[PDB]
Ligand binder design. Structure first.
Ligand SMILES: [Cl-]
Length: 162
């Protein structure tokens, strides 16, 4: 298992514009298009992202290209961020994938907001971090996915995805 496989399980693959769990227009493997409620504004962003006139439908290859870009962006966001980088550097390979997952979902700035939990992780206090992460809106809104991420942090194994 690796980060791509993990996020593909968490986000799914949809080739037609859809609404994410929060009602925002998205496409492919969790690629957010826009928070505007306008489907046309979504369609427009999609055309610009892909470089072609799509009418709301993309191919598998195009979804995978957006995915490659989004994973690369998450990783560079971690490495650039003063709060996130030291945490990433402290972690083992599996737990690193879990942090990438969160950044992909919530954004660099959002994850950097989990100060307390990040510290716990850096200190390798797995159980304490797991308990703290579960108090968040994140956990309450998307509990099945958050539990998988938390378990990965708790154990350092890919068991929640097996
Ligand atoms: Cl993009």
């Amino acid at each position: 298992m690796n980060i791509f496989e993990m996020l593909r399980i968490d986000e799914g693959l949809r080739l037609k514009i859809y609404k994410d769990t929060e009602g925002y227009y998205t496409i492919g493997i969790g690629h957010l298009l826009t928070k505007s409620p306008s489907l046309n504004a979504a369609k427009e962003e999609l055309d610009k992202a892909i470089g072609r006139n799509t009418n709301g439908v993309i191919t598998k290859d195009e979804a995978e290209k957006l995915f490659n870009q989004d994973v690369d962006a998450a990783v560079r966001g971690i490495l650039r961020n003063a709060k996130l980088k030291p945490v990433y550097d402290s972690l083992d390979a599996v737990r690193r994938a879990a942090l990438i997952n969160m950044v992909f979902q919530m954004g660099e700035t959002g994850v950097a907001g989990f100060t307390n939990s990040l510290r716990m992780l850096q200190q390798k206090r797995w159980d304490e971090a797991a308990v703290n992460l579960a108090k968040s809106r994140w956990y309450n809104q998307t509990p099945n996915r958050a539990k998988r991420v938390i378990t990965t942090f708790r154990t350092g194994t890919w068991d929640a995805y097996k």
